[PDB]
Design a protein around this ligand. Structure first.
Ligand code: ELZ
Length: 322
């Protein structure tokens, strides 16, 4: 009964507070209200409005799929961080309910979320290295040791999420952010996230088509293993410099994911045996036979050891795709 009253006290105002208050308030998002989780972003007289209390970077350059992520600055404190705009009308409660209260170096920290009119503005740490997607484009494709190194870090994040029965729902290079030197990778974008205990029912927004697991596309029941398939599709993208399936099939790719064998022919022949063995185990069509996050993180960790550890520089020379 008191949660009713706690929620009412948050509605109508932007406040400094904790993750659990943000989650409580976020649930009412299917007027300027919100909760800011860091001292660096401060409301002013119950408010936190764009171009008043915080401003985006000089010419408005945008990143992510929809150009919806921006560099910003709190006008009072001068602290810079990142903001992701989500339209309120299609806002998914889970995006905040999942990541709020998490604390792992493999997941990008949440700094707050403020509703203003038709927007939900979600604030987070600005990681200056850019996404792993941008790295692949710039370098053409990644060397094996660097590819393993990041896959392992992504899988560390997934262990952490899977232990709390949270599915990421859209694991890929565009959703892994790198620190300024390239040595730390963290999962971002919980817009497709999901709490656990099939996916094709009403509320569900599907992830990236190329990285979809077979049980997702056939409408079969789905668990945390979904993410593992995606992580290995991301592995192939890092190595080959292109998504799986795109090179061999032009038409609707979700029909070929269902019928065809898993894309293990796309594993480079020059990869070391345990790299190829690891990718095969994460790309088993039946989730019961497919490696878990913990299982796969351990193999990938030894696969990296088997090729002499992380040696190649962050931004080496361009390597041509397939
Ligand atoms: C914990 N939270 C809270 C909100 C969250 O669901 C998100 C997100 C999201 C989605 C797409 C993105 C991103 C986030 C994203 N975030 C950043 C960032 N935080 O810095 C960037 C990025 O690459 N920014 C900088 C790159 C260097 O130039 C300055 C901008 N991107 C570009 C990649 O597209 C989530 O996961």
């Amino acid at each position: 009964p008191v949660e009713e009253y706690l929620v009412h006290a948050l509605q109508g105002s932007v406040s400094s507070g904790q993750a659990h208050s943000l989650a409580s308030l976020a649930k009412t998002w299917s007027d300027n209200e919100g909760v800011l989780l860091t001292e660096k972003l401060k409301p002013v007289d119950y408010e936190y409005r764009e171009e008043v209390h915080w401003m985006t970077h000089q010419p408005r350059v945008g990143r992510g799929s929809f150009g919806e992520v921006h560099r910003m600055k709190d006008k009072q404190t001068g602290f810079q961080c990142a903001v992701k705009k989500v339209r309120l009308e299609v806002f998914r409660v889970e995006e905040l309910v999942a990541c709020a209260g998490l604390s792992s170096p493999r997941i990008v920290p949440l700094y707050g979320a403020v509703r203003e009119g038709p927007w939900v503005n979600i604030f987070m740490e600005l990681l200056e290295g850019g996404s792993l997607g941008q790295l692949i484009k710039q370098m053409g494709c990644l060397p094996e040791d660097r590819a393993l190194y990041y896959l392992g870090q992504a899988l560390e994040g997934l262990e952490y999420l899977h232990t709390r029965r949270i599915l990421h729902g859209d694991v890929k290079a565009d959703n892994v952010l790198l620190s300024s030197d390239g040595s730390r990778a963290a999962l971002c974008d919980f817009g497709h996230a999901l709490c656990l205990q099939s996916l094709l029912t009403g509320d569900y927004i599907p992830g990236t088509e190329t990285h979809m697991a077979p049980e997702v596309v056939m409408g079969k029941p789905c668990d945390a293993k979904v993410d593992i398939w995606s992580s290995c599709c991301m592995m192939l993208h890092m190595l080959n410099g292109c998504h799986p399936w795109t090179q061999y099939f032009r038409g609707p790719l979700c029909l070929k994911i269902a019928s065809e064998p898993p894309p293990i022919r796309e594993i480079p022949p020059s990869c070391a045996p345990l790299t190829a063995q690891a990718i095969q185990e994460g790309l088993r069509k039946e989730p019961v036979h497919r490696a878990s996050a913990m299982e796969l993180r351990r193999k990938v960790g030894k696969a990296l050891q088997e090729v002499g550890g992380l040696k190649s520089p962050w931004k080496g020379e361009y390597k041509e795709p397939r």
